[model samples]
Target: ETIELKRGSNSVYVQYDDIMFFESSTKSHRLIAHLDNRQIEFYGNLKELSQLDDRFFRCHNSFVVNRHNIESIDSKERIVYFKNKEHCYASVRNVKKI
Candidate 1:
C-alpha cells in the first residue's frame, strides 16, 4: 500500500487505505488528511505526488481530497464535504467519499 504524508509544524501520516479526504488549507502550505487520530499534513506540494495514486485527485488547485471520507457531494456546486468534523473543508472542489 502507498502512504501520503503531511510534514510540517503539525506532521501527520496517512496510510493510503485509511485516508478519507485530503483537506485543503488556505492558511497552510500543506493538505490535511482526515483520519482517525490527528490530521496528517504533507509538507510538499500535493500536485507533486498526487499522481502517485489514483485515489489522490485534485478537485481544485487549492484542494486535493481523498476518495474515502467524503460523506456527501453537492454536484451542482462542485463542493465536497466530510462527515469528520475536525478536518472538513468547505469549498468548491472535490470531497472525500464516505
Candidate 2:
C-alpha cells in the first residue's frame, strides 16, 4: 500500500515498505515520515494516521511505527529499531506487546 504525504505544493506517494515510521514533529501539526535514507515533513496527526492501516501501530504518543519495517524491539528500553538503524521508543504501557 502507499501513503500520501503532502509537503508544501507537492504530494509524495510512498509505498509502505519504504516507510519506517511517522514522528510527531517539534512543530505542532507537523509529522515526519522516516524512510531508509529520507524523511518527509508534512501535516498529520498520529491518531488518524494509525487507523489508516493494520501495519501502522501507535507505540508512543509521538511515534507511529510501521510494524512491517521494524528490525527489532528492545522491550526493556521500549525502543523500536528499523532496518536503517533508525529507532523510536514505545510507551511503558505498550512496551511488552511490541
Top candidate by TM-score = 2
CA deviation > 4 Å runs, candidate 2: none
> TM-score of the candidate numbered 2?
0.93
Model 1: C-alpha RMSD to truth?
Answer: 4.2
Best by lDDT: 2
Candidate 2, backbone clash total: 0
Q: Residue 6 in candidate 1 has what lDDT?
A: 40
Candidate 1 residues lying further than 4 Å off, grouped into runs, are: 4-13, 83-98
Give all TM-scores, in the order shown.
0.62, 0.93
Model 1 clash count equals 10
- Native-vs-model 1 lDDT? 0.60
**Residue 26's C-alpha lDDT in candidate 1?**
89
Residues 1-98, candidate 2, lDDT per residue (tens digit)? 87889887998998988989999966756799998898888877889889988888898988998888999999988899999899999999987765
Worst 10 residues of 1 by lDDT: 89-98
lDDT of 1 at 67: 61
Deviation in Å, model 2, residue 14 alpha carbon: 0.4
Note the residue pairs that clash in candidate 2. Answer: none
